[PDB]
Amino acid sequence: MIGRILLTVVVIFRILIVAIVGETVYDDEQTMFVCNTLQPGCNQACYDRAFPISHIRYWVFQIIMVCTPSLCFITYSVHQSRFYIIQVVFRNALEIGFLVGQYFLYGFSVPGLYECNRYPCIKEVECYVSRPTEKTVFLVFMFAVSGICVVLNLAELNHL
Amino acid sequence: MIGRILLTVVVIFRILIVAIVGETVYDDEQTMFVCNTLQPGCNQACYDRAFPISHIRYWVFQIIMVCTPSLCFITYSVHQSRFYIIQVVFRNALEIGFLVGQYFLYGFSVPGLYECNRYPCIKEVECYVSRPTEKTVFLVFMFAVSGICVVLNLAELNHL
Amino acid sequence: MIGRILLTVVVIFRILIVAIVGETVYDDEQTMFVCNTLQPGCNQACYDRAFPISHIRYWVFQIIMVCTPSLCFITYSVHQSRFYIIQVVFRNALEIGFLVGQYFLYGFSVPGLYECNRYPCIKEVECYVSRPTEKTVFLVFMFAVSGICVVLNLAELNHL
Amino acid sequence: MIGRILLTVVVIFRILIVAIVGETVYDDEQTMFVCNTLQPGCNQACYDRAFPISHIRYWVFQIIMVCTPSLCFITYSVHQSRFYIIQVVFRNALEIGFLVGQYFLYGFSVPGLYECNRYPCIKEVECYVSRPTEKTVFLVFMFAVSGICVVLNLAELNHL
Amino acid sequence: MIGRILLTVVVIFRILIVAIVGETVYDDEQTMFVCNTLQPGCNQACYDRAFPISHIRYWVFQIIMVCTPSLCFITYSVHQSRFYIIQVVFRNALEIGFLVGQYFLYGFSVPGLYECNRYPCIKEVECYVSRPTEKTVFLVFMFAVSGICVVLNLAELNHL
Amino acid sequence: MIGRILLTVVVIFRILIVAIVGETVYDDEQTMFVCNTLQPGCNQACYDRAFPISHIRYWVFQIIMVCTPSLCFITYSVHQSRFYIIQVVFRNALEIGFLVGQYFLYGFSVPGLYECNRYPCIKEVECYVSRPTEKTVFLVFMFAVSGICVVLNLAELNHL
Amino acid sequence: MIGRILLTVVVIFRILIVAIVGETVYDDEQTMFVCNTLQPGCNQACYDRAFPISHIRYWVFQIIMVCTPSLCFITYSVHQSRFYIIQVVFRNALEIGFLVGQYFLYGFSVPGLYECNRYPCIKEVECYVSRPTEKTVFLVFMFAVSGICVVLNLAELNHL
Amino acid sequence: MIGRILLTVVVIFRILIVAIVGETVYDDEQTMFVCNTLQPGCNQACYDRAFPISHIRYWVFQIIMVCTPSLCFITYSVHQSRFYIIQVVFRNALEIGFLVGQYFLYGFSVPGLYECNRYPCIKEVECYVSRPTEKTVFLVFMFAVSGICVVLNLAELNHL
Amino acid sequence: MIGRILLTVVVIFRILIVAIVGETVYDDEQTMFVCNTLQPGCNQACYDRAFPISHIRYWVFQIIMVCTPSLCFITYSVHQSRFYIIQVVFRNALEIGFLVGQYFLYGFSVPGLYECNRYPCIKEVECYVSRPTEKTVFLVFMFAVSGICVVLNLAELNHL
Amino acid sequence: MIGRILLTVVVIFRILIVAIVGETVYDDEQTMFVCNTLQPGCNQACYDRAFPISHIRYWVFQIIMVCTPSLCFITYSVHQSRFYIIQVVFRNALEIGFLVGQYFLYGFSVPGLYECNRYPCIKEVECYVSRPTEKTVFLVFMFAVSGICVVLNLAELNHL
Amino acid sequence: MIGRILLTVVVIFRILIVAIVGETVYDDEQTMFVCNTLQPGCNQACYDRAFPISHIRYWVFQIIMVCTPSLCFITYSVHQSRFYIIQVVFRNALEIGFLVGQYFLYGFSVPGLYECNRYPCIKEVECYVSRPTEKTVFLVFMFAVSGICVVLNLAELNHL
Amino acid sequence: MIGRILLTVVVIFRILIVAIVGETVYDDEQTMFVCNTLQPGCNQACYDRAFPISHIRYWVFQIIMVCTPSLCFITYSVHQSRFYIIQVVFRNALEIGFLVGQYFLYGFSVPGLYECNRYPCIKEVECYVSRPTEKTVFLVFMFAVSGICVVLNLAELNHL
Ligand SMILES: CCCCC/C=C\C/C=C\C/C=C\C/C=C\CCCC(=O)O
Ligand SMILES: CCCCC/C=C\C/C=C\C/C=C\C/C=C\CCCC(=O)O
Ligand SMILES: CCCCC/C=C\C/C=C\C/C=C\C/C=C\CCCC(=O)O
Ligand SMILES: CCCCC/C=C\C/C=C\C/C=C\C/C=C\CCCC(=O)O
């Protein structure tokens, strides 16, 4: 009983946190990225190698993707127990996959230094990241929230 | 039955994905485009030759264009089975044409280097693109979604 | 019968296209305009001579102006066949005048080079435009939409 | 009868024109203002002397000020012919005063050159304005609209 | 009777004026502040000494603070003559205090020059302000509006 | 009785103050941060060491976190005295913890100078902060509001 | 009799004037030559077109060339009236030819402005010369001295 | 008797002073000449107008010119009282003319500021001279030496 | 008889011309060499490829080398007809070899443009030379003098 | 007896020291003089105020001036005991005057900082000198040598 | 017999070649040395590591050192066969040692690229040399001359 | 006997080495001295603290000073065994004192890094020296030569 309330509260909290404040930490991600070199075009290559995909893009995609089964169920109901089981299983699988993917993609920390050896950069150069601590805190917070969501989903699945 | 629900869900998902996050990857498309030269006016010419039309503009136009028949049908109903068949055929043709056009215009990847030989640039110069990986991922995702939409439309057409 | 539906659909489509995407192509119109000279104040004069009025301003003004008769009719009705005829004639005249004015003002293409001979620029200098292809495509699209609107208005006028 | 409808249409048209497009022509008023000198602080002084108050600020203030009597009448009615006469007289006086003030403040054209002789600028220097033609067109359009409004108000006043 | 209507109109007018146009004059307050020196860090110190708190921040705080008693009364009524007297007294005191505080903080004019003698600036340097005339006009207008509000509040207090 | 009204008023006042004006003081936090050195990458490291987390982020997180129990209670009621006691205790604990955390994290003032000795900066360098006075005022105001909230919560807890 | 003394004095005076002070006016001929353009390589082309050969080089060559017959006569005498006549004729011819060549090459004045239309310069540009007045004075002085020398040589030739 | 010794000593002293130290004060005459403007080509024009001919050039020419009669007399003697008288008269005339010419050309002081109104400089600008005091001292010293020389020459002329 | 005198005069003339004026045309050979690129190190490589050895170095070496046999003969005489013949043959061979080498190394003209395709320069770039006309004139003059010397040496060789 | 030898040795030593090494310490006197300001023309004024006359110029003038009586005596002897006495007195007076003048002009040390308050510099600025220690050592050494010379001259004067 | 003449000629030729032209190739050795980095102080360290001692310094030292025995012999003779033998042996040893030292120090070629990994340079950077070809030619020429000198010295030693 | 010859040879060798090549290593001593900071005036102070007196100045002074007794003896002889002894003692003392002074002033090596903590430099900064290896080699060579000179002087002193 309380599990559903907690799940809804956690989902809304995650959505609000991502929407309100997330899109400002990464505003100047590339403008403040500097490398120690004179070669034109090294900054772009090194930034693209360091950060292939931004964290906020991944989190937005995950948020939108993990809420499709509810829309499908609502649409079916409007047009109108098996659907419940199928959607619960799909939600659990989606959440677990997204959590594992985040872990394998980003890790647990954002270092303040990067070593870049991509053309046109000559040999290996050093580049400096902007705001590592805030991004590390964001990473840890999102991981914790996703873990709580996964735990609640598994508990609900095992209830039936 | 389920086909209509899936089609609506896919359409709404595509619209949301394009609207929320698409208009930020391409924000600094031209500000971070750099060429290796001293000649004034080479950057503008080379950028215009590399990217005649931005991806987001094309996707917005496609999204708006593929939803006209529904508006026409709604307007006719408000003023008030042949119309259904005609609009289904028109939608299928529009989707197929837009998919083929996207493929012929952009391809499947965005390279990180460009070779530019347009006046006033002297002989051939080299220019460097910003964020190739994110744009490649966006291209592949949009192509997949459009393919799914085309498949569903063809299935619905063949149902009757 | 279908003519009214098509006219409304075209009007709404034009309004949406102008509103959503139009105000971003011209965002950096003057920041990326460069001339080959060292004289202060030549860039401003040459930009003002090349582009006295931006396209988006003209299109917004046209959109707002071509929808006044409907507001007048609605206001008269709220306060409450001759008015219908008068407003149809006024709309036709406004649309034709705006189309001819656009043609005489801008033409059909935006060249990538400009020759500037305005004070304080010494003799004749060369300046380079930003994004000619997108603006040419926009010009052609708007001209086509306006032509379709004019054709439909003339057909409706000749119906009675 | 038609006079009231025309007055309302003109007021709404003016408000929409000012709101939608006005706040973008003057966005870079000071960033693109350049003077021919090396002295620090001459640009700020010369810009402040050339343009003490921006046009858009004046127009917004005028728009907000010329619509107070209607609010007063509505509030009195909610709390609940002399009030009608008093508010008509007040509106006429406000409109005439604002028109005369605009004429005495700005004139009919915005020149492309300015001569500046304010400290710390040494002797007389020359400064260059950005977008004179668009601002001149805006000035003329606003003057015409205000004149039409004044004419309609005087006609309504003389009706009774 | 008319006093309440005038007070409400003045309050709404002040709120609208502050909200719509106020937040654009001060947009580039610090970017266009220049001092005549080569020492790093002198600009920040001199700007902070010249303008400890921006005018718009103070005005927003005053606007929000002078409308608390109404919210308290509304909340008490929803939960449900002494409260009326207490809230009137509180409003009068708040308005008078804010007016006196504004006068003691800012004055009546914004000079175009500042003399700065704060570390790390060596001896005394000169700095140049941006847009003094507009800010002076804003100061005078806000002072006049606040004075009118205080007069009306005192009249209402003395009525009973 | 009055305690609930005061608590609600204080909460709404805090939310409005944070939302409307807070997100503009810290807009240029990193762009105007300057250090006295020539070494690339020293600015980023020194800024990250001086300000690990921005104040506005912390305040937004606190505001969102201190209002979860109300949402939980509302959800339980919609699904439908112990819950009241539990949520009151949780709110008190959350507020006290957040206040103590703010005190231990930030303190009571923002100095205008910082001493930085982080790699790649050689030995110890000096960096200069932007807008210390406004941020100090914000710190003190937020601390006072939070203290008032804690006092009211403790009073309500002791009432029962 | 006096003619020989005057000729020797004039020759020595010319040599001393050229040697001592001539090689310093033209020291910064190319470093202070500036053109109004941004195109790389325009300065070199325009300087080479304006001044194919420096004046001092021509004068040094003339000085060395007009004194060969004396060396030939001295060498013949050391090895040891016809030779006298032949060398006088040769000297007269050399002096006349050099004077006419100087006139046809340089003229009588050095203007302070030049119009340059050589690749890579686009269309026609303007360039600014350094020290026109000193070079004009030098030109006139050298022409006068050469004329006096020619007159004396012709007088000596006609004596016999 | 002593007059000849004093004249020879003064001549040798003047020659040595001019030769050894004179050619270093004016080494950076044009490199350190700065004008307050942004217009290319204003520095060259203003420097040429301020200093048409350098002082050292004039002094070298005067030194070389005032010693020709001695060379003529020596040459005549080698080839071998009227010549004595003629050369004395010529020397006196040359010295007086050169002194008057120096006075009319340069004056008695070198100011530290110049007002320049020559094309391409717009209106009147201000330029700053390098080393005024040393050049003033040099001017006065040379004038005094030349005056002493003239006095001695006149005394010798009047002796016979 | 006259041949020896002419040969000595030509040799001395060549030596004087090379010594006095040659070492100033090439003073700024590398400082004024500019290439159209942003790549560091392209200027050095392109200059070294365009001008492996300077003309003046070659001419100085040739001048010193073509006068060794005279020194050898003088030394032998001091220590003290076959030697005469041997040294004449050696001189003729040296002069012919140096002339042919100059022709094969440099040619007859110095172009004003160079095409450079050496690492690190990307593809082919364009570089601009300084003072082509003076260097071409010098080349032609030196070639003519060397040819005259060779002709005289051959005539003397054939005399015996 | 030994006094004459010591005087000659000291004079030659002073001349050699001044000639060989003196003219290199002051080579970059003005190029390395920097002031903390942005105002054009402040560097020239402040340098001219700090160093009206260079030390080396004064020392060269003194060296040349203190050796005139010997030249006068030599000239009189060539043309050919009172002259001896007169020249000794003149030399003593010249040396004493030059020593006192040096002391009153320069002092005993060259500080590394200067405070400048001359137009166009605003208020008082700070400027930094180049090579204070070497110049101080030179000052002390020259003062000591001049003192020794004065002592020897006085001893010789008192001998007779 | 001829060996002594050849040795003297070679020595004088080497001295002249080194003196006249050698001191101009290396004039801009360090000014045109560029490295691809932004770190201050990397250029100095990398230049010092690449070229510890300049070639011209070594050659001058060798030239001066290999001619001491002749001075010693001349001094002994002036003061006035064993000395002959001793000085010949010393000269041979000195020449052989200097040749071997040159070979071990410099080699046979000067590359156009250098790899630098000295503090403060981060990891390994690339630097570009100026005029490699001329310096290689100089190296080879000096080596050949020194070898010829060594051969002649050994022949003379073996003669006795 | 041989000792005098060796002493003269060493003295002449030292003089030649110092004169010919010494004055070029230190030509750019201050132009290539760089410190890691942004503060104006830190470079001058740090250079003056690192190198109070240049090595070449000290060596020139020592060379000139150690040869005074010979001049005194020559002058006494021209005017014309105790003098011999006195001058030998004076020379020995001068040489020993100069050697010890050099050791105490400079040491044995020139490091490539310097730590500077002089006003206006903030705290301690790092500066980079130019050409440490050449200067170290020069130091060692001069020390060795001076030691040899001292040894020879002591041997000569002990001979008698
Ligand atoms: C300064 C505050 C303004 C923030 C503006 C930023 C973004 C727009 C708002 C939300 C987008 C962010 C995250 C995902 C939110 C909603 C997805 C809809 C899900 C659904 O419907 O199933
Ligand atoms: C210029 C004014 C515009 C400001 C835009 C900025 C931010 C968007 C608005 C609010 C976010 C700021 C603070 C927290 C507010 C609400 C949290 C929701 C709490 C709940 O629902 O429990
Ligand atoms: C600052 C003064 C130093 C000036 C140095 C400049 C040049 C060197 C001197 C002279 C060269 C100039 C002009 C021609 C002079 C002599 C030619 C020799 C003629 C002959 O022998 O038949
Ligand atoms: C401004 C004029 C000063 C020029 C100074 C330049 C160079 C020094 C002089 C001459 C060197 C140039 C060319 C070759 C001359 C002589 C070689 C000696 C031949 C021999 O002895 O067999």
Ligand SMILES: CCCCC/C=C\C/C=C\C/C=C\C/C=C\CCCC(=O)O
């Ligand atoms: C442009 C030409 C001027 C060149 C000036 C350069 C240097 C000065 C001259 C010579 C120094 C160079 C090399 C060695 C020469 C002589 C050493 C003396 C040997 C001895 O006496 O035993």
